[PDB]
Amino acid sequence: NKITPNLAEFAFSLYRQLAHQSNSTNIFFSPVSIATAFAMLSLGTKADTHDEILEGLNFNLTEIPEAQIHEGFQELLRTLNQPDSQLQLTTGNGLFLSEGLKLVDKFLEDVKKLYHSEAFTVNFGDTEEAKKQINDYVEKGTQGKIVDLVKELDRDTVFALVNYIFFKGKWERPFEVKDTEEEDFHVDQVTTVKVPMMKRLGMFNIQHSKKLSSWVLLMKYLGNATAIFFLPDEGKLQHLENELTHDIITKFLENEDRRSASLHLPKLCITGTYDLKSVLGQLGITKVFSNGADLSGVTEEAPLKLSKAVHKAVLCIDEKGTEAAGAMFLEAIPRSIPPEVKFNKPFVFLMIEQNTKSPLFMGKVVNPTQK
Template sequence: LGIFLLLCLFPRRSRRSVPQTLPHNADFAFSLYKKLSTHPEAKGKNIFFSPLSISMALSMLALGAKGNTHSQIFSTLGYSTLTPDQVNEGYEHLFHMLGHSQEAMQLEAGSALAVHEGFKPVDKFLKDAQHFYEGEAFTVDYSKPEVAVQEINKYIAKKTKDMITDMVKTLDPQTVMMLINYIYFRGKLEDPFEVSLTHEFDFYVNENTKVTVDMMERTDQFDFYHMEELEKQISRDHFKNWEEKLFVTLFKISAFISLQETLQEMGMVEAFSGAADFSGLIFNSHFCILIFSQVLHQAVLKVNEEGTEADAALIVELRLLSGWLSEIMVLNRPFLVFILDSSTRSILFMGKVNNPTE
């Protein structure tokens, strides 16, 4: 048996004009996936993340970035040919398009700024974050890290329907602001699997390891692809003709990723250093240097006979560096998984399942 690709799409919705950022978001998604999948620590591990959540959060932070810091953020996200207005208006449009739940689908996305008590970001940054990225703001006392951790985790749990409950473990007392982005998706299959047909089956993680999983079964016609070759060349062009829906393995996976190193490798260097220029976000930027200290992302995917539930949250921690504080086809090998929005072609979630029991 070969190694196969698992593809999953949202229920179809009417197509409307799409934001200019979407092709660039797709390119960033695959660039990030290739970086994550080739990291030595990722070998044999599940990979799952929301590229749209990451793009949204970093684009929102770019509102306050200037100079080379801004250029590096835009370059990493693939926005070099776009103006800031095009990017911001694109996300305003995208939030509007995504914010419509239907009977068979629930989709929620949003952002927040957890700001340290007494720290006042530039008014224009706060207004633009709210206008373009639906970014609400609330205050947190980071000088009491344990209390701040509880408050932020409580906020994330509420927005992700308790699928992500304990994302933040510790906080630097020097933190002055944390950006939170979340995407929640729950969709029912148009043609659910029969629960009575679900049975235990062997899943081959690799040549030497197999695990027992609950396997869903359906008689139908499906396209499939050998993954090893596809994974090397995968890009947004591959999605043009992918219209099949197929879920086979019953599973739940969760992935936690620290993105600092990966984003720096992709070109976003200044934001993590003393050269960072966030003068559009903070007053007195000549005396107080604001830098990224952590970029953490967690995503959860749950698939059963009725449908799919997926959630993602991203946090960017900012602190002051100075100054102030019909044939039988069995998918029993590692596979790729995508959740797309058919109206915007947004890649909301993507990843690779090496072991569905982890």
């Protein structure tokens, strides 16, 4: 599929921003769930509003027309719904509509044809019935991996573009369940904690790259899939992160060779939860949340903007295989033109005696509890 390279780079792009944001934290995300939600969103959007997005999903528009893109997506999504039988792989892109919404059909058609979208009809005014209906469609799409994707749901909520992906794949070679031997994880420069560490001896597709100063191990799944890992060298984690490319990835994919090794790889369950707004904004994708937000391509009546862009992604690893899930969530409610200035982020301020123009106090609010 012709679009894959861009996705890869967008995954690297997007990963980078998340680590650039917090070194001291766990990271896991679905580049696909995200980009899809947004390409699938890009349809209701037009002009320079829309352009930002797809140059920010790492696409070169002075090269590929819009048509050739959305085809690629369509193809890929399809591919994933029909794997080998031993490999469980689903994806669903449901679109929940407020009851009483005057739509455009050009949009309506397009997301149904190209993005297998499912439209449902919910009362956002009954917000805690709306939360249920939506957390229903996720907590089954993800087959019960992700449930609480919507914790706060606006009543003024127009619609909600929702996306999910479910993965469950068993290993090429399961691990010894009795050989799962609790061990030390050297967490930071400084600290150490106990994990259920799985150990196995055998012949492994693994190599060191001078370029990435890392060990690159591949673990083929039962079916048509592969997890790739990277043991950075001592103090090379950031150098590694720095240096990842699609083509480097491709090179590794094809390396068929194996060799003897003793491997220790831990049993774990992790989550990444995100409001991406900030993050994405950094990728150039700012207009679509704002009051210059072009959502004409969805409906006439009312003028909207994209409220919160929320991703959540869990992962879980054990001897037999992997459980992995991604899940987008784009809320939109009525845009209001009248310009908006909210001090919902840390800020400064004085207080001045009018007559003599002298500061009584000054300060910076950085948090109101407890400070």
